[PDB]
């Protein structure tokens, strides 16, 4: 149990990167946090939804509005373009994202695993159907709601006027198709994650990536197998010292360099 610190040698990393046949890129929020008086993690829970579906929908309406307008940043683009370029060489890049904003998709990434769902899908709490939804606003009663300042008045929308299911004989209440804290991730998605992690020969962990479980154990699983992991993050994390490399800085700076 040597005091193992990660390398910051970019040239050594790029040596691995030139040879790698299957690169797994794990990403997080760099793309709690607070909306009004609440920690984001405390809205993103089925108990918040069961007990105040209006407050949760006002929050996800906000998130949909804010994120729906965002363009991909230099990190997303570099990751997308690295996938295309390596693709033409018979080399695999896959992104496993903890994010729900779809910005990897907007940047053109094709091999993408969204492990916590999407702002832009709903699921019906009655019949269970999942559907895409980019409609702004998602229902009329949320029009102009969702403002983030502490002190902003609650909408208090009656449940009947919240987003509703359009399937025949249904009209049930919709929720965001987002995996919430205390909910299980999709078992089929976790088995696919396992297969990518077991076969990759290089893993990057970006934006980080290391405080939401089980996703937080993904890169360390890869390193515990002896495969190199490079972490790109503005600060160090509880997992850093498990990895082969650590590149500090905003990843709109480092990632483009590392992936070039």
């Amino acid at each position: 149990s040597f005091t193992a610190r990660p390398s910051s040698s970019m040239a050594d990393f790029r040596k691995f990167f030139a040879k790698a046949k299957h690169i797994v890129i794990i990403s997080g929020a760099g793309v709690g946090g607070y909306w009004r008086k609440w920690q984001a993690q405390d809205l993103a829970t089925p108990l918040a939804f069961a007990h105040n579906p209006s407050r949760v929908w006002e929050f996800y309406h906000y998130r949909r509005e804010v994120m729906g307008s965002k363009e991909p940043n230099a990190g997303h683009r570099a990751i997308a373009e690295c996938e295309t370029r390596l693709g033409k060489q018979g080399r695999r890049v896959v992104v496993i994202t903890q994010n729900i904003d779809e910005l990897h998709r907007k940047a053109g990434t094709k091999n993408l695993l969204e492990i916590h769902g999407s702002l832009f899908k709903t699921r019906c709490t009655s019949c269970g159907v999942v559907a895409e939804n980019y409609k702004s606003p998602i229902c009329p009663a949320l029009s102009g709601k969702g403002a983030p300042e502490p002190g902003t008045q609650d909408a208090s929308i009656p449940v009947e006027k919240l987003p509703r299911c359009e399937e025949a004989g249904c009209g049930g209440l919709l929720r965001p198709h987002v995996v919430w804290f205390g909910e299980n991730l999709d078992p089929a998605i976790l088995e696919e994650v396992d297969r990518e992690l077991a076969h990759c020969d290089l893993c990057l962990v970006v934006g980080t990536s290391s405080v939401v479980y089980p996703a937080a154990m993904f890169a360390p699983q890869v390193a515990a197998r002896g495969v190199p992991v490079a972490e790109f993050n503005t600060e160090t994390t509880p997992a850093t010292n498990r990895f082969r490399f650590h590149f500090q800085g905003p990843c709109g700076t480092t990632l483009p360099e590392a992936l070039a």
């Binding site: 993690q41 916590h116 995996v179 804290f181 909910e183 299980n184 078992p187 939401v212 479980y213 089980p214």
Partner: peptide, 6 residues
């Protein structure tokens, strides 16, 4: 283990 948490 499959259960999302912080």
């Amino acid at each position: 283990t499959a259960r999302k948490s912080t």
